[model samples]
Target: GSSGSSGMALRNVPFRSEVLGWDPDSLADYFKKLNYKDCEKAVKKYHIDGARFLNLTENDIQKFPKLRVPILSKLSQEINKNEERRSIFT
Candidate 1:
């Protein structure tokens, strides 16, 4: 139940880029550091917020794979956290 636009934008990206200042390796480590469980849960939460077409196309997945996985993971985590926090505070 967060901002639907942000979630939609993520799922619709044509590039493998993460949000500015977020990296997968850092995110993976940060999640471990802070013990923020449920990275996938965040993904699903977006779905609950009316994020249809959660599935990334094969091309999109391939594009995503071009990025370093660690940083992408971190970016993914951070964006979700960012939206979640923004939703709560706003």
Candidate 2:
């Protein structure tokens, strides 16, 4: 049976489903509270590619490595980014 969706549209749902993280709109303004450049630096310190981190499955987390507090502290710095956010993707 052919489901209605075709091409890129079909793949979009799964890609979004893979994301696991705080809500963007809710956090954007908070990130903006800090200087934007600082936010970018914070991302690098964690080696946190948003797409990669969000896609990490529970299995991956269990099998891979745990992030140290310093790294997590860096990620925490950007928690505000989730609030009312607009990304390049959007």
Candidate 3:
């Protein structure tokens, strides 16, 4: 156990980015390069739900080894698009 900046040992905390070895935003950008239609297809193929944005978390991300980066970015884009829809409606 080691003390972290907050004075508590950071051992228990999950360093997801370290495990992924890449920043989340980079994954998002790479994902955006895929055409929108293909992004939708990959999302469905990987069981990504556009509605439940919570599914984008690292825990869920780790499930798709083949399309992890694209899935993460697709989800971010989907969530943002949904947010825009709601904002316009409200």
Candidate 4:
């Protein structure tokens, strides 16, 4: 069993509130961009719309054994990248 950096990535990433958000079509677009065929159906199969894309957790992908590590890793980084738009500094 291994540990370390992997444990750190589980930090909170949230559901987005987009004015012009992601839909099934756009999700398919994203999946297609990633060369992940038939992933849009899989994603929507779990109530995973565009808003939930960034909110995807490890277990979400884990259920789909067909999904690979790189996709999850890429998603983690995508969350990190979007983190700048997190909560407001009240």
Point to the candidate with the largest lDDT: 4
lDDT of 2 at 33: 38
Per-residue C-alpha lDDT of model 4 across residues 1-90, encoded as one tens digit per residue: 576433223343433444027674566555655555556566656555665566566666664445454565466456546544656775
Residue lDDT tens for model 3, 42-68 = 445554543323346666555555544
**lDDT accuracy of residue 85 in candidate 3:** 34
- The local lDDT score (0 to 100) that residue 21 gets in candidate 1 is 39
Residue pairs with backbone atoms closer than 3 Å in model 3 (clashes)? none
Q: List candidate 4 stretches off by more than 4 Å.
A: 1-20, 82-90
Candidate 4: the clashing residue pairs are none
Candidate 3 Cα misplacement greater than 4 A, ranges:
1-33, 36-42, 66-78, 85-90
* Reference-based lDDT, residue 90, model 1: 36
Q: What ranking of all candidate models by TM-score puts the best one first? A: 4, 3, 1, 2
Which is the better candidate, 1 or 4, if ranked by TM-score? Answer: 4
Relative to the true structure, candidate 4 reaches a TM of 0.50
RMSD of each: 14.3, 15.2, 13.2, 9.2
Worst 10 residues of 1 by lDDT: 46-55
lDDT of 2 at 68: 30
Instruction: Tell me the tens digit of each residue's lDDT in model 2 across 33-61.
Output: 33333343434454444454444445424
* Winner by TM-score between candidate 3 and candidate 2: 3
